[PDB]
């Protein structure tokens, strides 16, 4: 319901950046960088949910999902 | 199959047949007014109640 107080602690909003390689083909996998956006403390053992990676033309060129590796 | 559907993006109409809620809130008000006026009053008088003799002919 729209009127409800949700105070989460295990969820962080993140921005995902990636590089589209030359001659990229569908089904191929690429590395991504995940960066927190606001007042989050750590992303040490987090998991990235389904994220569509848009280009400059605002079209989906890849889908991102996996486990983050943070140095610590 | 309804095709690809974004997970975190806000639900927006994208194709023909999709629905959208319009909140009709119109409040338009225009007004104009003007006026003009002009007035002119003029009074003039001259009277010789008692005329001396040397001025009588005039």
Please provide a brief summary of the model.
Chain B: It is found in: Cell outer membrane; Bacterial flagellum basal body. This is part of a larger assembly, with chains A (72 residues) and B (58 residues). With 72 residues, chain A is an all-beta fold.
Describe this structure in words.
The structure is cut from a larger assembly and holds chains A (72 residues) and B (58 residues). Helix content of chain A is 0%, strand content 36%. Chain A has strands spanning 14-18, 32-36, 47-54, 60-67. Chain A starts with 13 loop residues before the first strand and ends in a 5-residue tail after the last strand. The N and C termini of chain B lie far apart (119 Å). Chain A binds chain B through residues 49-52, 60, and chain B through 4, 6-8. Chain B: The basal body constitutes a major portion of the flagellar organelle and consists of four rings (L,P,S, and M) mounted on a central rod. Chain B: Belongs to the FlgH family.
Report the span from N to C terminus of chain A: 38 Å
Shape of chain A: globular
What class would the helix/strand composition of chain B place it in? Answer: little secondary structure
Helix/strand order of chain A: EEEE
Number of discrete helical segments of chain A: 0
PDB class: motor protein
Keywords: Flagellum, LP ring
Entry title: Cryo-EM structure of the LP ring within the flagellar motor-hook complex in the CW state
Chain A: Flagellar P-ring protein
Give a quick set of tags describing it:
part of a larger assembly, 2 chains, A: 72 residues, mainly beta, two-stranded antiparallel sheet, 4 strands, 0% helix, globular, B: 58 residues, little secondary structure, 0% strand, Flagellar L-ring protein (chain B), Flagellar P-ring protein (chain A)
Strand and helix layout:
The structure is cut from a larger assembly and holds chains A (72 residues) and B (58 residues).
Chain A: E1 14-18, E2 32-36, E3 47-54, E4 60-67
Antiparallel strand pairs in A: 1-2, 3-4
Chain B: no helix or strand
